[PDB]
Amino acid sequence: LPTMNTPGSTQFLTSDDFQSPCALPQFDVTPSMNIPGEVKNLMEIAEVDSVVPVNNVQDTTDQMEMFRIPVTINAPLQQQVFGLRLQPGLDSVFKHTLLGEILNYYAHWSGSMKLTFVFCGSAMATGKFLIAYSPPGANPPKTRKDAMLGTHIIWDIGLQSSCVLCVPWISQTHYRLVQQDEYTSAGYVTCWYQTGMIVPPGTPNSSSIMCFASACNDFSVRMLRDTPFISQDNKL
């Protein structure tokens, strides 16, 4: 049967799908067992919440302190609680979270995100907070009046101790680069005092808040790549 070899023959492509001979002919495999916890897609992992280390103050002698956002009883009428860049795969805040780790194995991402805040103060304490997301622009907000123009939610602390801020997917392109640059910016997220925290007598004067990050049901990734967080110099 006449034949002609085309270019690419005898090459080894690491991502090919070809049949090959079996070295252990007629090997009987062990019967399957339905172990609990089967995972069929990394996105299922990506959708689980994880604590975000927002308090990266360059002076954290205690590592666990990075997870707590300080709050005080007597604050200037309007005062910023925190601010951060929305770069889930590049910013130091999201770099090592359960979501950031998955993204670092890819190059493109798209979809919305969830940020959940939980108040871990006393039961008698109360307050209100304004959390706003500012799409990309030439300047990040500096005061509450600037922040309130963008997407935001007013959070009231009560019996329900958690509030969810859904960051919508507002972008000019269907996808964004994990190694984000100026062209594919995503904006900023900030939190401000809405009313202030009030406490009765006989309670601590300070409290803390924690943030959780996760992906919505429309999130996706593409173009698999090798992560840069792990490296070696010599064979183990």
């Binding site: 090959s20 172990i35 069929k40 308090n55 103050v57 329900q160 958690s162 698999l224 792990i230 183990l236």
Partner: protein, 278 residues
């Protein structure tokens, strides 16, 4: 008979208008261990959008379906030291960092394997290099646990009668083979929090369940007047994969090939203050 014939896009956004009611989707309680299922449509007005994005590339089958190097070693065609003319490697996936981390995201795995071998040769430097040598040939032998192990390049054990082997000649395509699921248990285990002896003593960790055998390589009969060095690289490519019980990715650098030992590491990098955004 002659022929028998044999896609799931992400969820679409839905138009949402102004609302004023007692329902409060935004408020929840993380204490239950339950992740909120809210969507942007539940907190802001949204337009109708049809999404054609698909999560095809995030499947475990595709995530692990890439060949990765797992071991590389050098052996010479001729030398004074007998042990230096052939390789003997106990099979294990903990030698190379990248694939080790990739696999260690799951506790239990069950997959078929595809093995590819890349072999290259080079002439050692010396004062006299003028020689003519025909093409070289190499032998790869797999020894299940407990089988005889050769002690020299020209040992009798190299006459495999039951042990599978491959003979390869330089200049052709790399050798390849397939391996089924060959674990005594129902699934491979990346971690094992236990001991070997029933009295809670002896070996500890995943080193106890590593009994996959050995691999040996040699030059079939090449023995040049001058030394020639060869290097072999082994690549693994899981197929038909299933995984269970996801785990958090490793944060600290690896330090041992058969242990979890590590050094404490900071959680992440630092910035000027909590408000710095530039």
């Amino acid at each position: 008979g002659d022929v028998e014939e044999a896609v799931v896009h992400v969820a679409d956004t839905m138009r949402s208008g102004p609302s004023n009611s007692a329902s409060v989707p935004a408020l929840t309680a993380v204490e239950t261990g339950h992740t909120s299922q809210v969507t942007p449509s539940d907190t802001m007005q949204t337009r109708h959008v049809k999404n054609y994005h698909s999560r095809s590339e995030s499947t475990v089958e595709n995530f692990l379906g890439r060949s990765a190097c797992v071991y590389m070693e050098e052996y010479k065609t001729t030398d004074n030291d007998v042990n230096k003319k052939f390789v003997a490697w106990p099979i294990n996936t903990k030698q190379m960092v990248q694939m080790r981390r990739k696999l260690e995201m799951f506790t239990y795995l069950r997959f078929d394997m595809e093995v590819t071998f890349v072999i290259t040769s080079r002439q050692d430097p010396g004062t006299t290099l003028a020689q003519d040598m025909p093409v070289l040939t190499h032998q790869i032998m797999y020894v299940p646990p407990g089988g005889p192990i050769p002690a020299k390049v020209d040992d009798y054990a190299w006459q495999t009668s039951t042990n599978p082997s491959i003979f390869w000649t330089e200049g052709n395509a790399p050798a390849r083979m397939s391996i089924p699921f060959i674990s005594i248990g129902n699934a491979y285990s990346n971690f094992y929090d236990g001991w070997s002896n029933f009295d809670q003593r002896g070996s500890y960790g995943y080193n106890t369940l590593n009994n996959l055998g050995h691999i040996y390589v040699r030059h079939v009969s090449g023995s040049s007047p001058h030394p020639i060095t060869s290097t072999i690289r082994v690549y693994f490519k899981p197929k038909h994969t299933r995984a269970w019980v996801p785990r958090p990715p490793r944060l600290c650098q690896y330090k041992k090939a058969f242990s979890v030992d590590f050094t404490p590491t900071p959680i992440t990098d630092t910035r000027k203050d909590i408000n710095t955004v530039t």
